[PDB]
Design a binder for this molecule. Sequence first.
Ligand SMILES: CC(C)CCC[C@@H](C)[C@H]1CC[C@H]2[C@@H]3CC=C4C[C@@H](O)CC[C@]4(C)[C@H]3CC[C@]12C
Ligand SMILES: CC[C@@H](CO)NC(=O)[C@@H]1C=C2c3cccc4c3c(cn4C)C[C@H]2N(C)C1
Length: 388
Amino acid sequence: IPEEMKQIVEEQGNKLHWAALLILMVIIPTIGGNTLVILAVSLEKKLQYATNYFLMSLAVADLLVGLFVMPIALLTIMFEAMWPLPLVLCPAWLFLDVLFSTASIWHLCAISVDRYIAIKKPIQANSRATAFIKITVVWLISIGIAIPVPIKGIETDVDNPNNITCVLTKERFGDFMLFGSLAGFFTPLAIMIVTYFLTIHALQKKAADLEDNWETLNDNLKVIEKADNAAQVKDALTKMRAAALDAQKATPPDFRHGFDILVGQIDDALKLANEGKVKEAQAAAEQLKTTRNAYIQKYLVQTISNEQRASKVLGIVFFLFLLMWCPFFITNITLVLCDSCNQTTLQMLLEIFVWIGYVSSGVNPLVYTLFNKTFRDAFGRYITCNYR
Ligand SMILES: CC(C)CCC[C@@H](C)[C@H]1CC[C@H]2[C@@H]3CC=C4C[C@@H](O)CC[C@]4(C)[C@H]3CC[C@]12C
Ligand SMILES: CC[C@@H](CO)NC(=O)[C@@H]1C=C2c3cccc4c3c(cn4C)C[C@H]2N(C)C1
């Protein structure tokens, strides 16, 4: 039917405006936004340490996406029918695509776990070797999920060697489009949900112990004040010392120093109590209050509010990262799991959602680092080409 053949002639139209849109809105902000973070970690000597190395690994992964994956994925937009590049590049590009796309997700998952354990066990920290182990393991996972695509390969015809037409066929790669999405997306998703609620419980548990310490400390002061006996000053001071140390152990090693001072005073106080002079010791315990006010009280709200806000913004940005991948993977999963649905339009939907996921992974590290003043005014000097 010529009235339909002409319609397919219109279907294979010109789609340069969409390609220009993707260059302007996604690829350029990806390469630039990631090179900014890499420059920030590389140049700023004050930014160099354990966590930023992992963050830089993530930025490298996303930069590699925006450098090798997306420009070829464009050529597929324009040259819709047949794969233009050589035959080897179809498994090469697909492998790189899955590899990096998985690497970003698992990077975020590992960062979530780290940010949680840092709240749980703050005193147990995080060398360079730890970060190296983490980078290696994450990239090993990404390779392990990505390797079936180059191992299996794209079907070829002895008749038509040229017409490869790169696509993950449902018939050929069905199990991979299922279990690869399960191992690559939904598993770290569930992990991050678990660590989310665990982080809520961890923060709410840390906040209570600080209050108990506070009025543990405050109560015993009242005990020292009304102490007619000598022994109790030793007991009250001992328990105040324990409470002070316990409260100080909630933060990695400046109101925190006020605990050291406090303990010191307490020691001297229970020296007088050990000498017998209770009336002279209670007089110094009556001025433990100055240290208790100038440092401890301001320390309590600072820790809580800081960890609260940081975990909050981290949760939000990570949630918005994972939200923009959902269409791709729910479409990819159902595409396997539906013999009733139309496969053609279901493939077009993937061909659109890939760019939502692409822009989600591309701008993620920059967005995450922009909530840090040091990174911000490093970027400001970089976009003004000032450097150092
Ligand atoms: C050809 C299409 C894909 C667009 C071209 C992309 C490249 C060449 C462009 C797009 C955005 C550009 C980057 C934008 C931001 C910076 C920060 C600056 O401190 C160094 C240059 C650098 C890193 C630019 C280098 C060139 C750049 C990466
Ligand atoms: C729409 C054009 C088609 C052509 O077949 N391209 C794809 O389907 C690519 C395949 C992907 C994939 C498949 C299976 C598991 C996966 C992934 C990814 C990560 N994980 C864990 C990345 C995702 N890529 C971005 C797109």
